[PDB]
């Protein structure tokens, strides 16, 4: 008999314009159903162009507008090339294995393949829950065996929105 997961999770894929697809692949409820998907998915390190894998609990959409994310945030580590695949694996094994210890605060994880770097992130539900964000931080270090003095960033989703006075740099 299969070993259930505390939550059902859903894989999503997206390929940016070189147009966020964010089409969902499938959903799984056990460790065995997970390996059936992941074993037949290309490693993020081998993806060409600007692609993303999203692994979120069933019911949470990989977007800040979702009810579980609009008040949330994500820890972010920007990696050199050649490491995302193993980190991505360790990250999701910890998430699915309930190794983070923050109740229902986790929402999902993302690995984003880019030109000269890769970004992996883990999202949580409420950004003001410092107890939760700090605990997720330390767990990230341990599960990914980050060397000392690694750079990480926590961003609140609301602060990533572009709006008048906060449009960022733009052409003229």
């Amino acid at each position: 008999a299969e070993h259930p997961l505390q939550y059902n999770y859903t894989f999503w894929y997206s390929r940016r314009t070189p147009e966020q697809n964010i089409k969902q692949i499938g959903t799984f409820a056990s460790v065995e159903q997970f390996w059936r998907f992941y074993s037949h998915m290309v490693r993020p390190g081998d993806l060409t162009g600007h692609s993303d894998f999203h692994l979120f609990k069933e019911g949470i959409k990989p977007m800040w507008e979702d009810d579980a994310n609009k008040n949330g945030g994500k820890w972010i580590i920007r990696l050199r090339k050649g490491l995302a695949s193993r980190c991505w694996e360790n990250l999701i094994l910890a998430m699915l294995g309930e190794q983070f210890m923050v109740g229902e605060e986790i929402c999902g994880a993302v690995v984003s393949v880019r030109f000269q770097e890769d970004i992996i992130s883990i999202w949580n539900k409420t950004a003001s829950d410092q107890a939760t964000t700090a605990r997720i931080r330390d767990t990230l270090r341990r599960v990914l065996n980050l060397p000392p003095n690694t750079i990480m960033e926590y961003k609140t989703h609301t602060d990533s929105i572009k709006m008048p006075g906060r449009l960022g740099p733009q052409r003229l």
Binding site: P4, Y13, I25, R36, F37, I77, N90, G97, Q99, I151
Partner: protein, 68 residues
């Protein structure tokens, strides 16, 4: 603690080579994602001596290091 928990090792011991591909991945939209022959977890394949150097000293990208 959560009701259902699995350490890293237990998660791996539950991997089983299975040539069956889920239908969801045979979708045409995921051609670039489809891996026909099953791949074992990267945790079981040893790191290359280059993979070791990076993971032990600095993993951050040039881009982020430029913002310090």
């Amino acid at each position: 603690l959560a009701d259902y928990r699995y350490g890293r090792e237990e998660m791996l011991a539950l991997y089983v080579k299975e040539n069956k591909v889920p239908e969801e991945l045979q979708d045409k939209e995921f051609a670039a994602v489809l891996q026909d022959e099953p791949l074992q977890p990267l945790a079981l394949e040893p790191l290359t001596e280059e993979e070791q150097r990076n993971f032990s000293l600095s993993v951050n990208s040039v881009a982020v290091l430029r913002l310090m």
